[PDB]
Amino acid sequence: FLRSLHDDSISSSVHPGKEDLRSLSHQQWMSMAEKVWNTHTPNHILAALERLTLNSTQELKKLQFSQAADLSKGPSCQLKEFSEPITQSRSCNESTHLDPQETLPSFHSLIQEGWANSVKVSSELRRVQSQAQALSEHLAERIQEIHKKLSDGSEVSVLTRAAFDAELRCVILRGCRDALMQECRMLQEEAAGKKQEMKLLQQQQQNIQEACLLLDKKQKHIQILIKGNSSSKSQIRRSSVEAQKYVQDKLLPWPQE
Amino acid sequence: ALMRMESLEAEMEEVTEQILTWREQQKTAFQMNSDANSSCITAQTSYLSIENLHP
Amino acid sequence: GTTEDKCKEMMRLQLAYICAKHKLIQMKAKSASLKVGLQWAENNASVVQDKASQKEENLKVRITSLKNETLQIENHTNSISNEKLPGLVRDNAQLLNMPIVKGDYDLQMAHQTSCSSRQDLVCDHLMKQKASFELLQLGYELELRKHRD
Amino acid sequence: LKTDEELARSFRQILDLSFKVNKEISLQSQKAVEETCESALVRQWYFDGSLP
Amino acid sequence: ETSENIVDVVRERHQSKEKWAGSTISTLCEKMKELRQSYEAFQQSSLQD
Amino acid sequence: KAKFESEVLTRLRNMRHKIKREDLVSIEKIIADREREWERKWEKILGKCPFSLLK
Q1: Which Cys-Cys disulphide bridges does the record give (chain D)?
Q2: Cβ–Cβ contact F53 with D under 8 A
């Protein structure tokens, strides 16, 4: 019952009608609790509670040892094949396909790959730079050849040379613009192709945040329960003192009267 | 078996040499470009001067 | 290193990439422009002797027209190079961080899940404890009523 | 047995070597490009859009 | 006994897959080959300069 | 055979020591100088830390 209250507090879904069912559950427990106190002796109930408490402590210790063992076994350990298909493994399910848990890569390992990729780009730059220098030299040689053929000293030849240089400049500049646009297209396509991946990361990021909130809510509940249990303990001591005081002050004096 | 282990060691030495050789080649390549850029600043100014044909 | 050191490292990686990629694209554009220039120069080398027979007035008009076209293309090119290109490169540079971030997220999610589970266990224990206390509390309340009768 | 362990260790070191070398070369390349370009242009590359 | 132990140790080293660098799982020999190819490729790109 | 394998082990150790104490120390110093020179250069030009603008 308490767990159900807890899960609800955490899941904020106040379905309208759940209160009738809660009251009933609460009443059911009250009836059961009452029955327990009618059927058995207080001495036996408390004894039972003591035992339940010991069991609960032993369970916690076992869990401590088991989780310590899971942290020290960082992976060298080889998949020992042990055999009988005995346990169903159903547990609360069945589930555990997942353990690809290959050692998630470390920041160091990823960042190393990043720098390796950066070097690939720098290497490509050097290659293209060498190609551009060869082409520039080849173009200069060709322009000089064309200028030598138009050197017949006539005003028309000079103007024809200027017109050539101007047409050539236009073609080169068109070529540069088209190339840059082309490159921009590539960069856009690349960014567009990764846009989905980024959305996914955003979702993950939201999930991480949501999850952080959830952890915080849970943490608050834990703090409440801690306080709650401390208070209950004091109350149990008070309640015990009230019943004893009633017997001493109000019942024990009657036989004399 | 021992021969196979020896082969791995040889390969490791070879890859290590390759990484260090590559590092040296890049150090020379950046020194040569810094010397060439100092020389080439002089030549490029010349050719764009053909725009000054006013009289 | 502090999240801060890692961030710095990532940023460094981006900056190095931006610088290199920008220059690369500039060089790719230069190279492509030279190639087209060379191809054009080679195709029009034989036609230049036949144009020398054209009336002086037509060549002057053409040069002027070409000068105006060149200025327009230059202004478009500079706009692409100085405004559109740097933004796109920067956007692409940020994408370099994707695998690293993903890796971190994965690591965090894994950590959280582990923590949540641990919390659930603690909560469960405390609730069990409360359940026991409340049973006892009810026991005391019930006991006082019978003494009153 | 000692040789086998040393093989794995030695290789991790080689990977670290490769990494630091790649980073070195990338930073040198950055410096070379920055020296050929006017600081104002490069500033536009790195930071233009983030400055008011 | 020694002869057999030595054969096993060497076999395990050649077949064992581990995350050496990045996000990919590989044997020591594979990762070493990859690394070698990468620097061969880098060197070829520098000689064509 | 024991003597030869011992020599192989010594060669691997010498290689690793050479990489760790000689080669990586030199490379890490160059990387640190370059990163500092760069941060100083842009801090002077921008009047603020360059990384704050990218955050």
Answers
A1: none
A2: yes
